[PDB]
Design a binder for this molecule. Structure first.
Ligand SMILES: Nc1ncnc2c(CN3C[C@H](CSc4ccc(Cl)cc4)[C@@H](O)C3)c[nH]c12
Ligand SMILES: Nc1ncnc2c(CN3C[C@H](CSc4ccc(Cl)cc4)[C@@H](O)C3)c[nH]c12
Lengths: 229, 229
């Protein structure tokens, strides 16, 4: 069984390599460093894509086509758009949207691109598994729509826009592209995110503080999922 | 010799399939339809990625990893940012930038993403070949920086921003991602673009009118390049 685990930054996958503690062979390809290893019975490929839609799309496509992963789990941090999502909170994405896509000039709704869709879906099977686990571990796992764009959102004006337009709960910069690539190749995808800030004027300061912790919370939960597979 | 030819829209590669007039086997993969064929001595893979950074990244990565193209030529239309670039004019990109990347909140210049670069380079060998040809055919081939983002630029305020910030000459939505993927895998890339509008308030109307023509001009020139390879 082949499983891919992606992170955007190195700081997001370092804990994953720790927690697994197995020997990882390092395979470089297309500017990314893939860590191939073996866990219990499963074959795990880990990597950080680097920041953004382009980077994350490249890596996910590479993972799938070069290593043939049969599932893809993502784990990293995000900025909270809602009052009931607090720092360190866990969330699993039901739908993802590219909030910065704009073809309005062609009388198209924001986030839409022809031959595609505004919202992209994630694995219903995996999202279930996460709910099961979050339940046994007594963890308050929330769920919702995640917004993705190539901008670091640090302002209330954008916060509101995202929530009203797309009804999003959290923002980040790679979730939508991973889910999108996985969808086009028929690979079940699950996107886990841990809250590192509130995407406000202070978003930058807070992000710097909690990155490390939030990355761990996220990493821990994902490990427990890989254990149940 | 394997060569990939990409377009963003179907309307941009239809002329390419015509002009080549050879039998194309149709191979579907990851939501894209790749047309594999044989020309003179070269093996050509053609396709349209669909619109945007994500789509174009997926297809380019697929082309390279699944078909093993040794070169990548892109051809499509774009919106003019400068006074000396008129409708139907041809341009070959020297550098490409993702104009919508914004990590300013982390005191980063616009368009920059850590572990990467703001401007990405294209094949110096191919760009030369294009200059040679544009010279023999008595064609006024211009060259410059191309801006790429997931927004259709139709407003003067953005026009100015792009030119002042990045010193761009033309805007489109896929050039930067293709060049980026090609760079990470060591594949020479050349991005040809034909002017279809001026990215102004009227950009949408004009685009609709010239799409078809501009796509042809671009398609013709690229064919002549493939002939010289
Ligand atoms: N308010 C927000 N907006 C968008 N994405 C995020 C994220 C999620 N990711 C974290 C990460 C932030 S960008 C960055 C750049 C330079 C340096 Cl040195 C540190 C961080 C990106 O992969 C998006 C958390 N908060 C976000
Ligand atoms: N002002 C501009 N801004 C950005 N890109 C372009 C381009 C280049 N491409 C054309 C194409 C325009 S989006 C579109 C959507 C729906 C329909 Cl039905 C027709 C066209 C994209 O692939 C970007 C030309 N002008 C541009």
């Amino acid at each position: 069984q082949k499983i891919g685990i992606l992170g955007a930054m190195r700081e997001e996958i370092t804990p994953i390599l720790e927690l697994f503690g197995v020997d990882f062979e390092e395979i470089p390809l297309g500017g990314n460093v893939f860590h191939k290893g073996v866990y219990h019975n499963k074959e795990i490929i880990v990597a950080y894509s680097k920041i953004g839609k382009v980077h994350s799309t490249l890596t996910t496509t590479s993972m799938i086509l070069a290593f043939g992963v049969q599932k893809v789990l993502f784990s990293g941090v995000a900025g909270s758009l809602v009052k009931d999502l607090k720092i360190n909170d866990l969330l699993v994405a039901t739908q993802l949207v590219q909030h910065d896509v704009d073809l309005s000039a062609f009388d198209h709704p924001l986030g839409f691109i022809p031959e595609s869709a505004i919202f992209i879906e994630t694995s219903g099977s995996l999202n279930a598994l996460a709910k099961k686990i979050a339940n046994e571990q007594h963890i308050a796992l929330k769920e919702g729509v995640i917004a993705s764009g190539d901008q670091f959102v640090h302002s209330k004006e954008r916060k509101e826009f995202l929530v009203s337009e797309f009804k999003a709960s959290a923002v980040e910069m790679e979730g939508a592209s991973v889910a999108f690539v996985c969808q086009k190749f028929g690979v079940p995808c699950c996107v886990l995110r841990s809250i590192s800030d509130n995407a406000d004027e202070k978003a930058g300061m807070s992000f710097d503080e909690f990155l490390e912790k939030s990355a761990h919370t996220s990493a821990k939960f994902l490990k427990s999922m890989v254990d149940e597979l």
